[PDB]
């Protein structure tokens, strides 16, 4: 080999490190977004359960009202 071979080796290796780093950052962003969306789902399920309660009580009341 020579210095050219070692230099190209080093270059391609650095390239690999940068690609790896981009992959990493992508995974980090992934985890982040999924977490925030998780909180969003928390409040969604909250509103939904409240809605269910209200609907149930309403249905009971009308059901007792008709008869």
């Amino acid at each position: 080999m020579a210095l050219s071979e070692i230099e190209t080796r080093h270059s391609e290796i650095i390239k690999l490190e940068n690609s790896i780093r981009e992959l990493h950052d992508m995974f980090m962003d992934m985890a982040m977004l999924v977490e925030s969306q998780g909180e969003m789902i928390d409040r969604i399920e909250y509103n939904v359960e409240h809605a269910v309660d209200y609907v149930e009580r309403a249905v009971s009341d009308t059901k007792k009202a008709v008869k």
């Binding site: 790896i20 992959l23 995974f27 992934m30 609907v55 009308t62």
Partner: protein, 64 residues
């Protein structure tokens, strides 16, 4: 050559871990898709019940 081999081992481990990352990315993406379809379903049903409850509330307050 020890310098070179040490590095070689590193690259092999990185290779394996990268493969596992591939598998994980596939599972991740797939389940994300399926969950997206499910969310679509949820919004369909939720809009349906929204209309249901609006019309029902109007009809209920109509008899008052």
């Amino acid at each position: 050559m020890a310098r070179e081999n040490e590095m070689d081992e590193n690259l092999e481990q990185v290779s394996g871990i990268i493969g596992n990352l591939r598998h994980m990315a596939l599972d991740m993406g797939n389940e994300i898709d399926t969950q997206n379809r499910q969310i679509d379903r949820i919004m369909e049903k939720a809009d349906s019940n929204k209309t249901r409850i609006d019309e029902a509330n109007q009809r209920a307050t109509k008899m008052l």
